[PDB]
């Protein structure tokens, strides 16, 4: 039993809710919140910009130190950093950004990072400003992630769609 509330169950291990991940996160304090990061951990907009804003820019300060030490992530890769006031940990995962021409096959590799964590609150990778089809993204998520994932979808219209077209 865990503290996540109001989700619809898609599979044994995938759940989904119309929610703001920032507000979903501040209430649950999940062990892991996933950020839809870029390779530079520059959290300017989308989920990343919102999450970072909710940390009063502490996420960005920590991220800049990480990059200064380690260099950029790989597309499809991830790193674990602090969750600040939102979660114990933040798993920064780089999905491919279609608006940069990145290969969509890397979306499966991106979701594989979720399997290193027993339970996660997460957005749909490569959705939103990253330009992928959130329905394809949901399919890859369901077919790749084996751990327990709670998907927060900000847009009510999108959500209702994803549900109605799910197989
Ligand atoms: O649409 C984008 O560009 C992306 O970021 C994707 C797709 C939809 C939005 N996004 C989220 N997914 C789940 N919760 C969210 N809360 C937010 C608050 C914001 F100010 C901006 C985006 C989100 C957000 C992931």
Swiss-Prot record:
UniProt name for this protein: Papain-like protease nsp3
Superkingdom of the source species: Viruses
General function of this protein: Responsible for the cleavages located at the N-terminus of the replicase polyprotein. Participates together with nsp4 in the assembly of virally-induced cytoplasmic double-membrane vesicles necessary for viral replication. Antagonizes innate immune induction of type I interferon by blocking the phosphorylation, dimerization and subsequent nuclear translocation of host IRF3. Also prevents host NF-kappa-B signaling. In addition, PL-PRO possesses a deubiquitinating/deISGylating activity and processes both 'Lys-48'- and 'Lys-63'-linked polyubiquitin chains from cellular substrates.
Activity regulation statement: Inhibited in vitro by GRL-0617.
Subunit field text: May form homohexamers. Interacts with N protein.
Reactions listed under catalytic activity: Thiol-dependent hydrolysis of ester, thioester, amide, peptide and isopeptide bonds formed by the C-terminal Gly of ubiquitin (a 76-residue protein attached to proteins as an intracellular targeting signal)
Lipid bilayer topology: Multi-pass membrane protein
Subcellular location: Host endoplasmic reticulum membrane
Macro domain residues: 1-167
């Amino acid at each position: 039993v865990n503290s996540f509330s109001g989700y619809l169950k898609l599979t044994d291990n995938v759940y989904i809710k119309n929610a703001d991940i920032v507000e979903e996160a501040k209430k649950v304090k999940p062990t892991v919140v996933v950020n839809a990061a870029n390779v530079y951990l520059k959290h300017g907009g989308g989920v990343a910009g919102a999450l970072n804003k909710a940390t009063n820019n502490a996420m960005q300060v920590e991220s800049d130190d990480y990059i200064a030490t380690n260099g950029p992530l790989k597309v499809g890769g991830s790193c674990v950093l602090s969750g600040h006031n939102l979660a114990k940990h933040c798993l920064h995962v780089v999905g491919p950004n279609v608006n940069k021409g990145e290969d969509i096959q890397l979306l499966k590799s991106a979701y594989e990072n979720f399997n290193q964590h027993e339970v996660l609150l997460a957005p749909l990778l490569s959705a939103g400003i990253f330009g992928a089809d959130p329905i394809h993204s949901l399919r890859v998520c369901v077919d790749t992630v084996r751990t327990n994932v709670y998907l927060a979808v900000f847009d009510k219209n999108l959500y209702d769609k994803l549900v109605s077209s799910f197989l």
